[PDB]
């Protein structure tokens, strides 16, 4: 027996007893299952008192070693080929629950050994740098000698002729290729700094000046035979050092490549072990007694699966030790878990981003999944725009496997998570456009237009059409470019938005009644549900009924003047009625009675709820807030019209610009211009309209949702459930 999205979500409390020896295996099995949230019974103590604190420190050291390995791989541009293998491990963990293994100490020792080769490679790099410095001396070829980058030879010569004002010869010789510098981290053209002078003090001063001039001096002998012998020795040493450095570099590269073959897998395993240790530390345990005894959170539906998995683990365990769980009662608030299907997880996340629902059974926030696409559509309007964004959502949904494979992205991750919310939004928008006769501000007139202008339209003079019937669906096909069209559409979506909003509010309120009815809360129901229903019905539902009636009665044929809906509301609010016209002779009296009932319902909010108080101030504040919020939100829902008209006018203006750019004179040059004009219109429409208007309108519909719908029934915060499954990230070492 499993429960879906129907009502305040389901959860349960259970205590799992396990043997000490099989603690690691049970933890690995639970993490692979990831269907429990262990209560932090042992976490009441400080972190320094954790049972696996030393193991936690060892895992942290292993993580530091893995981070150093990743740093080395980045420093040598290793491919990290194990990243592909890590995806299979995450898939293996999600599907078949592979055993974690008890070789964690072996991986720890391997990490220490890898750090040993890391230090060896660092020493090899230092030796290579020293040899590169030594190779500079090899440039010496046929008194103080040195080498200096060519950029400072003239300055050095001027300093020498100034400080050593006497005569001192110089033997500048150019270097064929640049040599890398340590601090400068660059290779620059250099020149020889051979200089000869008399006097030991003068030689010391010259050496000091050269050292101040960022020079590296050399002791090459002046004797031709001696210089040749020294050069031969230096060449032999340089050849040996070059061979040694090449071998060391090859060995280091091979070791790094070999490590990269399993570096990601080892890191994922270390992360899993660290998570297991952290869970164990939070889990209750004892030293003398049999370890691994604790409680947690688990759904009722998952009990049988948990028992079967535990039995399988016990069979796989090296010792026949039973492992089961016990269900116990506790007044501490349980968590809440929403059963997320692949195409409703996005809706659930959007709904619960506001907060955490109360506990009960099944799962909650469901109506948002249907309402949000539809309310976004009711303001999105355009059939063509809705179809285009539905096609985009389909393209982003059909490739879910590739989408999961691809990087989440900064913004695309939210979009990818919405690969199914966007599709429903597109379908609803396409339907609304099938009503709103505007593909892109265009009434295709699929059906028969019910309106007809007079028989002979004037040559250049305006006329008023006449109709014999209503349109089968959507706006009447004759309303395209009509002067009246703006006012008629406005008067249309006034009642459209008002009625849709009142329907949404009343349905959410029904949800509210359902949530109250799940609990007992008899006083709560009597003091909150019935009188609020009386308010909103007897005022705003009466207004909606009047809006419907003014459409029901053919005031043109009946001859009775149509009363103003706003006028009727004003008369009801600050008069006993008797408007210039009325829906019905009783409807005036009925409206008066409904207003009287709504007024009388205020003390019901004020005092029926306490029924026993100092806390009644909160109840009074909540009642005032409820009344004001109902009024404000039902007034607000015309903001759906605001967005809808904005979209329609924007589409009309964009098409007007497109037509003016494209049509022109329909010539060959005109066709050339239109070729780019159509693409420019499509780009502008896509970017501005689709990318923005649609995202904004989804935000607007969601905002209306949290403002009104959930504000009607959301009971407040709660405990969010945790799966405690292994992350299987194996990435983002930073």
């Amino acid at each position: 027996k499993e429960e879906a999205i129907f009502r305040s979500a389901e959860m349960a409390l259970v205590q799992f007893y396990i043997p000490q020896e099989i603690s690691r295996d049970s933890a690995y099995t639970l993490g692979q299952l990831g269907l429990v949230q262990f209560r932090d019974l042992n976490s009441k103590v400080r972190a320094f008192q954790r049972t696996f604190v030393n193991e936690i420190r060892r895992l942290d050291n292993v993580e530091r070693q893995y981070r150093y390995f990743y740093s080395l791989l980045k420093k040598h541009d290793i491919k990290l080929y194990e990243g592909d293998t890590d995806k299979y491990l995450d898939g293996s963990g999600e599907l078949y629950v592979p055993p974690s293994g008890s070789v964690i100490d072996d991986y720890v020792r391997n990490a220490s050994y890898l750090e040993e080769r890391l230090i060896q490679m660092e020493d090899a790099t230092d030796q290579i740098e020293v040899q590169k410095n030594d190779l500079e001396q090899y440039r010496f070829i046929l008194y103080v000698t040195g080498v200096i980058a060519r950029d400072k030879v003239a300055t050095l010569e001027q300093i020498l002729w100034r400080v050593l004002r006497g005569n001192l010869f110089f033997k500048t010789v150019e270097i064929e290729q640049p040599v890398y510098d340590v601090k400068t981290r660059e290779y620059k053209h250099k020149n020889a700094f051979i200089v000869f002078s008399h006097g030991d003090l003068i030689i010391k001063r010259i050496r000091k000046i050269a050292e101040s001039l960022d020079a590296n001096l050399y002791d090459v002998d002046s004797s031709n035979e001696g210089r040749s012998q020294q050069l031969a020795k230096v060449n032999k040493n340089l050849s040996d050092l070059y061979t040694v450095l090449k071998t060391t570099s090859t060995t280091l590269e091979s070791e790094l490549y070999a490590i990269a073959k399993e570096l990601d897998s080892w890191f994922q395993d270390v992360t899993r072990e660290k998570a297991i240790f952290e869970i164990l530390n939070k889990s209750n345990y004892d030293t003398n007694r049999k370890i691994l005894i604790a409680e947690g959170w688990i759904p009722r539906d998952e009990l049988a699966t948990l028992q079967a998995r535990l039995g399988e683990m016990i069979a796989r365990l090296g010792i026949d030790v039973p492992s089961i769980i016990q269900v116990l009662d506790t007044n501490h608030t349980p968590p809440t878990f929403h059963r997320t299907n692949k195409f409703t997880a996005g809706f659930q996340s959007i709904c619960d981003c506001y907060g955490i629902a109360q506990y009960r059974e099944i799962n909650a926030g469901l109506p948002t999944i249907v309402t949000f696409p539809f309310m976004f559509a009711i303001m999105f309007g355009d059939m063509g725009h809705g179809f285009l964004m539905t096609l985009a959502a389909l393209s982003l949904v059909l490739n879910e496997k590739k989408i999961n494979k691809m990087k989440r992205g900064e913004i695309f991750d939210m979009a990818f998570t919405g690969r199914y919310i966007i599709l429903l939004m597109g379908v609803f928008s396409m339907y609304t456009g099938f009503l709103y006769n505007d593909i892109f501000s265009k009434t295709m007139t699929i059906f028969k237009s019910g309106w007809k202008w007079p028989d002979h339209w004037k040559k250049g003079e305006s006329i008023t059409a006449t109709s014999v019937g209503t349109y089968p669906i959507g706006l009447d096909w004759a309303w395209h470019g009509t002067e009246n069209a703006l006012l008629f559409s406005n008067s249309y979506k006034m009642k459209l938005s008002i009625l849709m909003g009142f329907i949404h509010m009343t349905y959410s309120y029904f949800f509210s009644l359902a949530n109250h009815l799940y609990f007992n809360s008899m006083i709560d129901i009597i003091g909150n549900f019935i009188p609020g229903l009386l308010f909103m019905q007897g005022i705003f539902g009466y207004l909606s009924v009047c809006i419907v009636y003014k459409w029901a009665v053919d005031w043109v044929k009946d001859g009775k003047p149509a009363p103003g809906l706003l006028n009727m509301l004003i008369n009801m609010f600050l008069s006993p009625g008797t408007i210039d016209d009325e829906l019905y002779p009783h409807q005036a009296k009925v409206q008066v009675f409904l207003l009287l009932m709504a007024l009388v319902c205020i003390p019901w909010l004020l005092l029926v709820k306490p029924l026993h108080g100092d806390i009644m101030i909160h109840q009074v504040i909540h009642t005032i807030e409820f009344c004001l919020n109902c009024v404000s939100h039902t007034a607000s829902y015309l903001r759906l019209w605001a967005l809808s008209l904005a979209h329609a006018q924007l589409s009309s203006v964009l098409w007007t610009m497109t037509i003016q750019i494209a049509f022109g004179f329909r010539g060959f040059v005109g066709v050339f211009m239109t070729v780019a004009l159509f693409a420019m219109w499509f780009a502008l429409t896509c970017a501005v309209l689709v990318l923005m208007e649609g995202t904004s309108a989804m935000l607007h519909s969601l905002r209306l949702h949290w403002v009104e719908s959930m504000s009607k029934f959301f009971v407040g915060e709660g405990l969010p459930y945790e799966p405690f499954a292994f992350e299987y990230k194996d990435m983002e070492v930073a």
Binding site: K442, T443, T445, G460, H480, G481, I659, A662, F663, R666, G667, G670, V671, F672, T674, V675, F678, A679, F682, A683
Partner: protein, 63 residues
Amino acid sequence: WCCTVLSAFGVVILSVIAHLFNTNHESFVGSINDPEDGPAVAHTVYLAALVYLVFFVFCGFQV
């Protein structure tokens, strides 16, 4: 690559416009304010669609 979708959408839109102009719907050449040369509108839209299809072919890539 990316421009191929744009070219295809433009070709489809221009083809629909040419069909409407040939049919002389209430919109486009139907409006008196708009030029009434419906055949000219259809010809212009058809040639624009041909250009857009050429752009689609040019943007088409195999691998």
